[PDB]
């Protein structure tokens, strides 16, 4: 290792490979001494993490294949309900941060591991695929009537897919401010699905943690999206999930915007009911 | 200009009283050299005798051992470390 | 439903406690417009009966109290806490009789006496809702509450809460001792730092915290408190040590009046005494170098060399000797508990030997507190040069500027909105008509204004969304550079970002970079070489970069931008040459860093001649379709680029007494500069006649004005030069006289524009070659 | 058009005109039975004078018709006080305002 | 298509490649040069 | 003292200029338990980055180059500035070798890190098989040494024409040979170990 100066090579054609910022690999016939590369092994704790996304990705391309086979044609390949229902709470335990009772010496090391762990994953999918499967999962509203396209094993597990999907989406955006910046481009997608009557426990604390991490997302919400929050405030009880989010949206990094200050004193306050 | 720039009783008193303290700093408190620092540290050292709990200087040292391992590419320039490193130096 | 009944339902008080944090999130960061509106919602007696209520729960107990400070008196504490450490005292008659010790060697009680620090009022406005609505309001300010009734309610809660704490109640007010003592102390700390209480009602809080030493029951400090309530105690004792530091600088500011009032008549007695003392010849000028040679901030250091060179008598040396050792004894050294220097020194170690802390803020807070009162002398030494003294007839001018500085740093921590552009610029224009902006240039160095005006610039510079604010931010700075000159090098290390975002209509942030290199040679030759290739990087970019200002306007296409790179040379020329003397280092580095760039020159000599550009340029400026078809003109920028190019090569040459000497390379830049640019290309442009007005007057942004003619005449002068006469009778054959008789024809802006040329350039060309 | 109903009988002697300062110890309450404005909470009498365009025109004509010691009831329609949008955070648009007033002193 | 990039992509997941030979028995031994191998892709998972 | 260096990685600020005075202070005396305090604590942590801090911190030092010298040679003659001012010589400083105290204290820190004649530190300081990155400090110091000699050799060849040499040029020589005084033995207490 390091004293290698070796290249990879053919056994039958007998010719080496190098390139001609991204450099395309070719089978060049001239060759020069720019192929004496040194071998380096990286850290071994995330290699099985790189393989588990491969295995679950082979599961999820099957899930992309199977769901739209009956989406365009009504029914009056077997789907693996038991294989996808238990694949995700182990990822929830995998992505859940440790508690507050630890010392700062050993907890922040695992925190710095888990941040670049999800930053390692967000290059190869991991945040496009969740909405790429829920984009035609949320198109039906009922639990057993509109979800009769697949079967009773899907009509019974209507709910237990999406309450883990939105929990996974929240644990992606838990704390880190490097991957929530690309969810600023279709913020209407997270602010138009609140009163859909199913899985309201995930999306609210998705939207709670998208506004703590980065200030590049809160210059987008003007008055066309701020009354849907008041609508769920009046339509789903008196929560503490729904007022700390407005307490967090106004102030960021110790500086506020007053294009978001009196917009709730316009609506929520002078009604007094 | 040095031949006839105007003397001190031509500039007013409110301009003289500020020319005062800027040189008073370089003349009077600049030359004071005392050892106030050995008096503070042995108090926090002898505070271990009371009537395996951490000592008050070790609280400061374990404080400053973990204020610098934050998730940051640029380390924070603090108010008190440039004083206190000189103190216990 | 009662607020007394949310102590048992476990569900409605977790909701109602978080309605208040949204109520103080909207009434925060200096936002005062809904602070008026929410006063109608939650008002005065609803606060004031409920705070002196006692059966309230803990979270709501703290939340309403933090709400009542964030809704009313936090827009008034930022302007005082941001300027508590800056010290300006007037020399009013109340600043002549103050002792450091109370007369009657005992230490005085801190925080009281008389202070005369210039601080603006909080400007309280009465809240009303029946008023008529305007139209956009200019200014909306904090609601007014009678504090005369609240000044005792801020004390009585603490006064009976401590006799409760000495009685050691098991279930006290709010549920626990933490909810007993955290909210009312954070209440009293804001009014204590805002300065509402007088000097004998803070007598009572110093009876409160410590009734054993502060005498002119149980104290607050010797009970066992949790670690979350006594950081506001560290804040208020930090405030007490801050005004204890204020008393020292107030006393020394009185002594600064005292010592010059002592000696500036001894000085004129000395000058009148030795004005007629002609008994000394070789020594008279040596003692007159004390009189007329030294600078006025150098005689003050010459005055006080009495330690262990002093023509001053022996009756005037000892009052400051008794003053400064009294200041030492006022500090921690005794100069050979009983005071608050021994009160809180044994308090931090007392709290530290009790239990291990859990918090990263208290172990920073009181560890910053005790080093303060230990090295009080070192803290005074770093707080006194940022203190100034103003004659007391300028208070009515300076409180306006202090309110404006309380406004600009109330607005820098809000992000820029739709109507936040005008309140910025009329405030920094209210700076301009103040007549303290030019009387003293260095109190602003103590106030710290000259970086807060660019910290607001880097917010909007990081496209640009605020075109109004940039030419107004540099408007303040461009006049700030040339009121004095030790303000110049406070801006010099900022030049890695001052011209980093320069590559607009109006003024651009390169104007202040050009003002950073003017009017002195030591600000000119001390440029580091790594900050100059970035200018020619933009010049080599615009050497074939087209203009985004032209194709979006609809004007014809030229593959490079003449006006985009025209003022990149004006900064370079003022960086090279200042005030009649050439630099010997930077003039050597500018030329070879210029001439290995192939794109930084024009497209003609990159290879047609020099007149081949200008002969097309004049005719495309005459044709309306070839030109722009509103002030930006491709027919005048093409020649303005060349005029900015050539004259820098003219006065980047070294001087003439370095030509005959043994300089091995100073002749070589001269040789390569006569070799790349030819000589017969000069006589054509000096030979080209004018379109002089006669009876019309043509356009100054579309014709050949002599601003460009004023370049080649100095390019002729000393870097090419004249030695014999067969060229002398040819440089003035057509070059000067058909245009100087054109001046004679009407001897009208063009006429004086060419007399600028005639009385700036051509006469020092022929006076120096008159022999 | 504003309807006035007295509450307690007063003087009937002095009713104000232009060039007169006035004190009114007013309370405010909207039509759905909610509190929004008062001077009871102040312990201050509100001080203004008529003809300065200070109060809204649904109040400036009703404040010039009463006397000393007189408690009245004025029901202002939304057309005479902030018709379009109004003050943000105080009154919703086009809601009626009902004030029960009392003149304290000073004509 | 296979490329080569700088250091920002050099900490990602699919820049990693593994070594396995053709035979099954004792394949996890210390090899020498002259042993035919295969270059393993781990994230998408298709050989080069 | 070490992790506040390890989290710095390439900043020559003013706090480094006190936390290395503390390092001089706590490593002075030739103590061995202060060395065995550090060795196991660095080897079992396995966090490289302090050695790249020492890699980057010693090459950002100022040299006796002769283009930044003859300009302040002229600027030092300007004692009196107009508009009622004096030269702020302490605020201008010496622009030639302004980083003198920084590399003065760093080299005595690496001196007294190994003055105790303990050779696991000398094999450590050049060869770290326990970590994945060798930093090899000694040839970096000798490239610093040859940058020094090809600086001061041309400094001598610049004024070999003039016989009598005056004050400030030789004071600039003095505060350079004063840091040469310590970098000349800072690699000798790497080699006098057995």
Curated annotation (Swiss-Prot), chain A:
Modification after translation, per record: The N-terminus is blocked.
Impact noted for substituting residue 258 to C: Decreases threshold for channel activation by K(+), caffeine and 4-chloro-m-cresol. Decreases inhibition by Mg(2+)
Domain MIR: 1-43
Tissue expression pattern: Detected in skeletal muscle (at protein level). Fast- or slow-twitch skeletal muscle.
Localisation per UniProt entry: Sarcoplasmic reticulum membrane
UniProt function note: Cytosolic calcium-activated calcium channel that mediates the release of Ca(2+) from the sarcoplasmic reticulum into the cytosol and thereby plays a key role in triggering muscle contraction following depolarization of T-tubules. Repeated very high-level exercise increases the open probability of the channel and leads to Ca(2+) leaking into the cytoplasm. Can also mediate the release of Ca(2+) from intracellular stores in neurons, and may thereby promote prolonged Ca(2+) signaling in the brain. Required for normal embryonic development of muscle fibers and skeletal muscle.
Similarity annotation: Belongs to the ryanodine receptor (TC 1.A.3.1) family. RYR1 subfamily.
Miscellaneous: Binding of [3H]ryanodine indicates that the heterozygous channel is activated by Ca(2+) concentrations 4-fold lower than normal. Single-cell analysis of cotransfected cells shows a significantly increased resting cytoplasmic Ca(2+) level and a significantly reduced luminal Ca(2+) level.
UniProt subunit comment: Homotetramer. Can also form heterotetramers with RYR2. Identified in a complex composed of RYR1, PDE4D, PKA, FKBP1A and protein phosphatase 1 (PP1). Repeated very high-level exercise decreases interaction with PDE4D and protein phosphatase 1 (PP1). Interacts with CALM; CALM with bound calcium inhibits the RYR1 channel activity. Interacts with S100A1. Interacts with FKBP1A; this stabilizes the closed conformation of the channel. Interacts with CACNA1S; interaction with CACNA1S is important for activation of the RYR1 channel. Interacts with CACNB1.
Free-text note on domains in this protein's UniProt record: The calcium release channel activity resides in the C-terminal region while the remaining part of the protein constitutes the 'foot' structure spanning the junctional gap between the sarcoplasmic reticulum (SR) and the T-tubule. Pore opening is mediated via the cytoplasmic calcium-binding domains that mediate a small rotation of the channel-forming transmembrane regions that then leads to channel opening.
Protein name: Ryanodine receptor 1
Native species: Oryctolagus cuniculus (Rabbit)
Gene that this sequence comes from: RYR1
Residues of the full protein shown: 341 to 630 of 5037
From Swiss-Prot, chain D:
UniProt keyword annotations, A-Z: Cytoplasm, Isomerase, Rotamase, Sarcoplasmic reticulum
GO biological process, one term: smooth muscle contraction
Presence of keyword Cytoplasm: yes
Tissues where the protein occurs: Detected in heart muscle (at protein level). Isoform 1 and isoform 2 are ubiquitous with highest levels in brain and thymus.
Span of domain PPIase FKBP-type: 19-107
Molecular function (Gene Ontology), one example: calcium channel regulator activity
E.C. number(s) listed in UniProt: 5.2.1.8
PROSITE patterns: FKBP_PPIASE (PS50059)
Major subcellular location class: cytoplasm
InterPro entries: FKBP-type_PPIase, PPIase_dom_sf, PPIase_FKBP_dom
Activity control note: Inhibited by both FK506 and rapamycin.
Pfam families xrefs: FKBP_C
Catalytically driven reaction(s): [protein]-peptidylproline (omega=180) = [protein]-peptidylproline (omega=0)
Localisation: Cytoplasm; Sarcoplasmic reticulum
Record's GO cellular component terms: calcium channel complex; cytoplasm; membrane; sarcoplasmic reticulum membrane; Z disc
Function comment: Has the potential to contribute to the immunosuppressive and toxic effects of FK506 and rapamycin. PPIases accelerate the folding of proteins. It catalyzes the cis-trans isomerization of proline imidic peptide bonds in oligopeptides.
Summary of subunit composition and partner proteins: Identified in a complex composed of RYR2, FKBP1B, PKA catalytic subunit, PRKAR2A, AKAP6, and the protein phosphatases PP2A and PP1. Interacts directly with RYR2.
Family, similarity comment: Belongs to the FKBP-type PPIase family. FKBP1 subfamily.
UniProt-recorded name of the protein: Peptidyl-prolyl cis-trans isomerase FKBP1B
Organism: Homo sapiens (Human)
Source taxonomy: Eukaryota, Metazoa, Chordata, Craniata, Vertebrata
Recorded name of the encoding gene: FKBP1B
């Amino acid at each position: 290792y390091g004293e290698s100066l070796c290249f990879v090579q053919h056994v039958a054609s007998g010719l080496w490979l190098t390139y001609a910022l991204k450099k395309k690999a070719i089978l060049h016939q001239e060759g020069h001494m720019d192929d004496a590369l040194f071998l380096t092994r990286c850290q071994q704790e995330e290699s099985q993490a790189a393989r588990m996304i491969h295995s679950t990705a082979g599961l999820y391309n099957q899930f992309i294949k199977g769901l739209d086979s009956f989406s365009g044609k009504p029914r009056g390949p077997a789907l693996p309900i038991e294989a996808v229902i238990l694949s995700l709470q182990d990822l929830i335990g995998y992505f859940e941060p440790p508690s507050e009772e630890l010392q700062h010496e050993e907890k922040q090391s695992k925190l710095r591991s888990l941040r670049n762990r999800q930053s390692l994953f967000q290059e190869e999918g991991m945040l496009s695929l969740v909405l790429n499967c829920i984009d035609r999962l949320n198109v039906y509203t009922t639990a057993a009537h509109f979800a009769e396209y697949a079967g009773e094993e899907a009509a019974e597990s209507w709910k237990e897919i999406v309450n883990l999907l939105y929990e996974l989406l929240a644990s992606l955006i838990r704390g880190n401010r490097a991957n929530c910046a690309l969810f600023s481009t279709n913020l209407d997608w997270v602010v138009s699905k609140l009163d859909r009557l199913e899985a309201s426990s995930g999306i609210l604390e998705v939207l709670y943690c998208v506004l703590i991490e980065s200030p590049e997302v809160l210059n987008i919400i003007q008055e066309n999206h701020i009354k849907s929050i008041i609508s769920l405030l009046d339509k789903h009880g008196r929560n503490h999930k729904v007022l700390d989010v407005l307490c967090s949206l106004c102030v960021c990094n110790g500086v506020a915007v007053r294009s978001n200050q009196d917009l709730i004193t316009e609506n929520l306050l002078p009604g007094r009911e | 200009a040095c031949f006839r720039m105007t003397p001190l009783y031509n500039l007013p008193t409110h301009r003289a009283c500020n020319m005062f303290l800027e040189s008073y700093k370089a003349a009077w408190i600049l030359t004071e050299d005392h050892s106030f620092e050995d008096r503070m540290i042995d108090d926090l050292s002898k505070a271990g005798e009371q009537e395996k709990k951490p000592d008050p200087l070790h609280q400061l040292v374990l404080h400053f051992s973990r204020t610098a391992l934050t998730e940051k590419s640029k380390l924070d320039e603090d108010y008190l470390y440039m004083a206190y490193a000189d103190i216990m130096a | 439903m009662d607020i007394l009944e949310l102590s048992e339902r476990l569900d409605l008080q977790r909701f109602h406690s978080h309605t208040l944090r949204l109520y103080r999130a909207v009434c925060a960061l200096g936002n005062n417009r809904v602070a008026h509106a929410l006063c109608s919602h939650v008002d005065q007696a609803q606060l004031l009966h409920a705070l002196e209520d006692a059966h309230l729960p803990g979270p709501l107990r703290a939340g309403y109290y933090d709400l009542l400070i964030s809704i009313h008196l936090e827009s008034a504490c930022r302007s005082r806490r941001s300027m508590l450490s800056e010290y300006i005292v007037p020399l009013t008659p109340e600043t002549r009789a103050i002792t450091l010790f109370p007369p009657g060697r005992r230490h005085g009680l801190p925080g009281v006496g008389v202070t005369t620090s210039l601080r603006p009022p909080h400007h309280f406005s009465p809240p009303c809702f029946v008023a008529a609505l305007p139209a956009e309001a200019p200014a909306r300010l904090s609601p007014a509450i009678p504090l005369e009734a609240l000044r005792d309610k801020a004390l009585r809660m603490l006064g009976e809460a401590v006799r409760d704490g000495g009685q050691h109640a098991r279930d006290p007010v709010g549920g626990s001792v933490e909810f007993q003592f955290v909210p009312v102390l954070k209440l009293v700390s804001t009014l204590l730092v805002m300065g509402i209480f007088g000097d004998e009602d803070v007598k009572q809080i110093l009876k409160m915290i410590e009734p054993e030493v502060f005498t002119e029951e149980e104290g607050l400090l010797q009970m066992k408190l949790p670690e979350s309530v006594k950081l506001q105690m560290c804040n208020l004792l930090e405030y007490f040590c801050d005004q204890e530091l204020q008393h020292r600088v107030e006393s020394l500011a009185a002594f600064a009046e005292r010592y010059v009032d002592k000696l500036q008549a001894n000085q004129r007695s000395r000058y009148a005494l030795l004005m007629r003392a002609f008994t000394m010849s070789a020594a008279e000028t040596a003692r007159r170098t004390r009189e007329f040679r030294s600078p006025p901030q150098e005689q003050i250091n010459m005055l006080l060399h009495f330690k262990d060179d002093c023509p001053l008598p022996e009756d005037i040396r000892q009052d400051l000797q008794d003053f400064h050792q009294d200041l030492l004894a006022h500090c921690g050294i005794q100069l050979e508990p009983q005071s608050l220097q021994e009160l809180v020194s044994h308090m931090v170690v007392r709290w530290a030997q009790e239990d291990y802390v859990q918090s990263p803020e208290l172990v920073r807070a009181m560890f910053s507190l005790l080093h303060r009162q230990y090295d009080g002398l070192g803290e005074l030494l770093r707080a006194l040069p940022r203190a100034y003294t103003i004659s007391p007839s300028s208070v009515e001018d300076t409180m306006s500027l202090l309110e404006c500085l309380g406004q600009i740093r109330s607005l820098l921590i809000v992000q820029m909105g739709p109507q936040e552009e005008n309140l910025m610029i009329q405030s920094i224009g209210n700076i301009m008509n103040n007549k303290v902006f030019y009387q003293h240039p260095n109190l602003m160095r103590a106030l710290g204004m000259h970086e807060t005006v660019m910290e607001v610039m880097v917010n909007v510079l990081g496209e640009i969304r605020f075109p109004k604010m940039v030419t107004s931010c540099c408007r303040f700075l461009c006049y700030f550079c040339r009121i004095s000159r030790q303000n110049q090098r406070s801006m010099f290390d900022h030049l890695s970002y001052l011209l980093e975002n320069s590559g607009m209509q109006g003024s651009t942030p390169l104007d202040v970079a050009a003002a950073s290199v003017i009017d002195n040679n030591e600000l000119a030759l001390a440029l580091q070489e790594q900050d100059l290739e970035k200018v020619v990087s933009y010049l080599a970019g615009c050497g074939l970069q087209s203009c985004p200002m032209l194709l979006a306007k609809g004007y014809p296409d030229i593959g490079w931008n003449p006006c985009g790179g025209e003022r990149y040379l004006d900064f370079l020329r003022f960086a090279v040459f200042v005030n009649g003397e050439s630099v010997e280092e930077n003039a050597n580095v500018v030329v070879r860093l210029l001439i290995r760039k192939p794109e930084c020159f024009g497209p003609a000599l990159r290879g047609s001649g020099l007149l081949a550009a200008i002969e097309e340029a004049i005719r495309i400026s005459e044709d309306p379709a070839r030109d722009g078809p509103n002030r930006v003109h491709l027919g005048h920028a093409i020649m303005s680029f060349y005029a900015a190019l050539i004259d820098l090569l003219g006065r980047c040459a070294p001087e003439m007494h370095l030509i005959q000497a043994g300089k091995g390379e100073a002749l070589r830049i001269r040789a390569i500069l006569r070799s790349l640019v030819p000589l017969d290309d000069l006589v054509g442009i000096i030979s080209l006649p004018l379109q002089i007005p006669t009876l019309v007057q043509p356009k100054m942004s579309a014709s050949f004005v002599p601003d460009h003619k004023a370049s080649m005449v100095l390019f002729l002068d000393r870097v090419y030069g004249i030695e014999n006469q067969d060229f002398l009778l040819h440089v003035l054959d057509v070059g000067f006289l058909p245009d100087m008789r054109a001046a004679a024809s009407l001897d009208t802006e063009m006429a004086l524009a060419l007399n600028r040329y005639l009385c700036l350039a051509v006469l020092p060309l022929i006076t120096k070659c008159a022999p | 058009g504003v309807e006035i109903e007295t509450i307690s009988p007063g003087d009937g002697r002095t009713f104000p005109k232009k060039g007169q300062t006035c004190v009114v110890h007013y309370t405010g309450m909207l039509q759905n039975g909610k509190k929004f404005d008062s001077s009871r909470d102040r312990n201050k009498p509100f001080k203004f004078r008529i003809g300065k365009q200070e109060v809204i025109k649904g109040f400036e004509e009703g404040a010039a018709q009463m006397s000393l010691g007189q408690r009245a009831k004025l029901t202002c329609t939304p057309d005479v006080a902030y018709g379009a949008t109004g003050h943000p955070g105080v009154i919703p648009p086009n809601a009626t305002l009902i004030f029960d007033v009392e003149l304290l002193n000073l004509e | 298509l296979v490329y080569y990039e700088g250091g920002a992509v050099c900490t990602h997941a699919r820049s990693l490649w593994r070594l396995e030979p053709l035979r099954i028995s004792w394949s996890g031994s210390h090899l020498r040069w002259g042993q035919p191998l295969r270059i393993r892709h781990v994230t998408t998972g298709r050989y080069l | 003292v070490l992790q506040m260096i390890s989290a710095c990685k390439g900043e020559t600020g003013a706090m480094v200029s006190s936390t290395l005075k503390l390092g001089i202070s706590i490593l002075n005396g030739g103590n061995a338990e202060v060395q065995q305090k550090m060795l196991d604590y660095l080897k079992d942590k396995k966090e490289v980055g302090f050695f790249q801090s020492i890699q980057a911190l010693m090459q950002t030092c100022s040299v006796l180059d002769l283009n930044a010298f003859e300009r302040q040679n002229k600027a030092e003659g300007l004692g009196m500035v107009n508009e009622d001012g004096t030269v702020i010589n302490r605020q201008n400083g010496e622009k030639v070798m302004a980083d003198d105290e920084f590399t003065q204290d760093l080299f005595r820190f690496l001196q007294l890190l190994c003055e105790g004649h303990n050779n696991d530190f000398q094999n450590y300081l050049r060869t770290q098989t326990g970590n994945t990155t060798t930093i090899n400090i000694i040839i970096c110091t000798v490239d610093y040494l040859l940058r020094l000699q090809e600086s001061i050799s041309d400094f001598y060849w610049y004024y070999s024409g003039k016989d009598v040499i005056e004050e400030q040029g030789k004071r600039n020589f003095s505060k350079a040979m004063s840091v040469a005084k310590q970098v000349f033995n800072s690699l000798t207490e790497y080699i006098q170990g057995p």
